[PDB]
Amino acid sequence: MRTDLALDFSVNKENKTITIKREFAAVRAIVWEAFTRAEILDQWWAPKPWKAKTKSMDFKEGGTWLYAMVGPNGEEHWSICEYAIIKPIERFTGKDGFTDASGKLNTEMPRSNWDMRFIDKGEITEVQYHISYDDVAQLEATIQMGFKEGITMAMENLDELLVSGKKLEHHHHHH
Template structure:
């Protein structure tokens, strides 16, 4: 197993996109499950000390994931992802945005399209690549200013811990 796992975060303002490449010390089926099953996502998706809490999830083309990021004081920030395409253990695309508790998208906040790809790297290592695109530069810049890189990095470290604990 590799000692240092890849974490690459690149912003491309010209193409209104963020590309994230992240390796995990686990076999592909386990990492796939960690991103596609709500009972596992709820254990790691939010940056500490926040927690993710799924309201509903239907992981299929045309389905969705509606969840809240719950803060240490009980505050909730809702999000809604609509799955467009799914290739089992290879990747999926989804439209993602902030929402209310009923799943209505908040059009005043950034919205993005995520293309998530999963690749077996051998030696119990899986590479996950996110290509996140925005309709305009303002949404991209707002996302960055909101601490997206730091929050996503923290959440990925939470998945590292969960994978190492064998408690999926």
């Protein structure tokens, strides 16, 4: 019976598409700023809690965002995204490409589509994610583990992150 912090997702294996819907108690302004900086996203987004490092981020219509997550011992993951249209905070789409290192991008790794939509419902902001790409086997393993680890880490990290952003630290409350 919870209203805010709602979690709902649907996957269509036949159509090979992934739909994730989430509801948070915050204005589009604050939410948009969170997706406008990879540093903020690194705080919660990007599963595998360890060390995330953004190689570069050019805020431009034809700009691109390159980042790679680093895990424990031997384990690294590289990814790259290309922005096509920015458009007002309303809604926009981009492209998600897989990377194995720097920008080698192997042929066995097809590009993926990821459209981002921001809907403002009064004092509650709702965000809809649309991701779809080939490689069903990898999709089933990445979505199952990514969804379980992503929502658990995102829910815990996001909860603390929202509190820090909203309630600003000032001094200890006493007397």
